[PDB]
Design a protein around this ligand. Structure first.
Ligand code: ADP
Ligand code: MG
Length: 451
């Protein structure tokens, strides 16, 4: 019942100044960060936005040379440092260790040191295997080497547990342990060797594996004995129902952070693109797509509408007229038409069988049209939010249709977005060449950015 500080995070002015629209775009760009729970702070983008110690900043930026945070770090660090229970779900190799380690270190460092009668630890990291525990312990050691105030001990079934004990005799601030082994240590020396009294921070790492390998009973037993108001975090590559059930029971008002759990675009949407080398070739492709649609219609005839999004009023006027020369009728809408003429076009589009709407991307914001069978993005969009909003005009659950982007060969940010928004399955099903050109473009954008 001794009071302890859990909430340390002071949001930097740079992050505070970020608008909610900017945060949404940032979360999309960081491998589709999705949050559940209330009061999650904005994600950070620099190590310097976190109030880390000078020494930690040196290790991270000058010895490990980390230049950017992973998505799970960007969002999990501020949330955990704000004292919240957090569930973090992110693919293997995405930096989950540091995501919990830096906040653990901060909380532990802030507390009253162990008195001579206190065994520790203050922090507990549970891992499903000896090998994993040892790895975590290595990281903990690295980040605590320069600081005498924090010791770590790795408690596993590692050859000489006898070499683990003698160490525990001296006390420790952090224990990294497999769950069965931790419980065993709790009974040694009449329960006087290692105590849970001062545990304020618990981490469950590789938590799906903690459960698969049969540790739920041990972990339940551990949670029941740690103080109820502990901070607890759970990190894992997957989040099966049984683990969720455990998490919900055991965590207090947790924040859930998932990194690319589902597609930012509805999975039923068929995403496509065509790379063109000039506006002329782009228009030729548009006409061809429209012709292929019409052929399909006859074939089917043994109401599927389309929207073409363009960037500007001028391009809208221009394409409407060119399509008409090619014998293609459209309803066009852009801010240069009076309100009545826009309504007229909307109602015509809705009323007419297999109609085509030509619309500027900004008129699409407040667009009163039902979802459609086909979206053609004539001018490739350059943000994730625009791409999700535009392709979303064909998202209709199981009855979703097709979204096609006409991409110029120098539209590197457009390629980058496609490369991240399309499904892995879609990218894999691409013709080797298409996939090659897309990746090169994406790569070019990526390098061009940092450099
Ligand atoms: N921001 C970062 N930039 C570069 N490398 C990182 C970053 N964060 C972590 N790493 C490194 O990436 C590797 C995998 O990190 P880890 O925490 O083991 O991933 P996970 O736990 O998600 O599988 C490790 O070598 C780790 O030190
Ligand atoms: Mg890990």
């Amino acid at each position: 019942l001794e009071p302890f500080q859990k909430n340390f995070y002071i949001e930097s002015e740079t992050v505070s100044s970020m608008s909610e629209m900017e945060v949404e775009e940032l979360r999309l760009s960081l491998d589709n960060i999705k949050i559940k729970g209330t009061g999650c702070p904005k994600p950070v983008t620099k190590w310097s936005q976190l109030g880390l110690s000078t020494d930690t900043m040196v290790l991270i930026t000058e010895k490990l040379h980390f230049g950017s945070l992973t998505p799970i770090q960007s969002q999990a660090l501020p949330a955990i440092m704000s004292g919240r229970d957090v569930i973090g779900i992110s693919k293997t190799g995405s930096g989950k260790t540091i995501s919990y380690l830096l906040p653990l270190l901060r909380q532990v460092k802030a507390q009253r040191p162990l008195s001579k009668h206190e065994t520790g630890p203050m922090g507990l990291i549970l891992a499903p295997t000896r090998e994993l525990a040892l790895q975590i312990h290595e990281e903990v050691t690295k980040f605590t080497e320069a600081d005498t105030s924090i010791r770590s001990v790795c408690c596993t079934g590692g050859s000489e547990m006898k070499k683990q004990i003698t160490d525990l005799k001296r006390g420790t601030e952090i224990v990294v342990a497999t769950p069965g082994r931790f419980i065993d240590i709790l009974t040694l020396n009449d329960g006087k060797l290692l105590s849970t009294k001062r545990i304020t921070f618990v981490v469950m790492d590789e938590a799906d594996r903690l459960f698969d390998l049969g540790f739920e009973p041990q972990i339940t037993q551990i949670m029941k004995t740690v103080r109820p108001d502990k901070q607890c975090v759970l990190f894992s590559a997957t989040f099966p129902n049984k683990l969720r059930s455990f998490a919900v029971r055991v965590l207090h008002s947790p924040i859930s952070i998932t990194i690319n759990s589902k597609g930012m675009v509805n999975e039923n949407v068929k995403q496509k693109f065509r790379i063109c080398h000039s506006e002329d070739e782009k228009f030729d492709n548009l006409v061809q797509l429209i012709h292929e649609r019409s052929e399909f219609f006859d074939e089917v005839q043994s109401d599927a509408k389309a929207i073409i999004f363009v960037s500007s009023q001028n391009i809208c006027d221009f394409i409407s007229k060119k399509l008409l020369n090619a014998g293609i009728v459209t309803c066009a809408i852009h801010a240069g038409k009076p309100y009545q003429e826009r309504l007229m076009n909307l109602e015509k589009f809705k009323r007419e069988k297999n109609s085509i709407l030509l619309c500027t991307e900004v008129l699409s914001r407040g667009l009163n049209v039902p979802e459609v069978s086909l979206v053609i993005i004539y001018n490739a969009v350059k943000t994730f939010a625009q791409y999700v909003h535009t392709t979303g005009r064909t998202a209709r659950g199981s009855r979703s249709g097709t979204a096609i982007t006409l991409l110029l060969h120098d539209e590197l940010s457009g390629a980058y977005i496609l490369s991240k928004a399309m499904r892995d399955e879609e990218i894999k099903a691409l013709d080797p060449l298409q996939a090659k050109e897309l990746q090169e473009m994406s790569a070019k954008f990526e390098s061009g950015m940092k450099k």
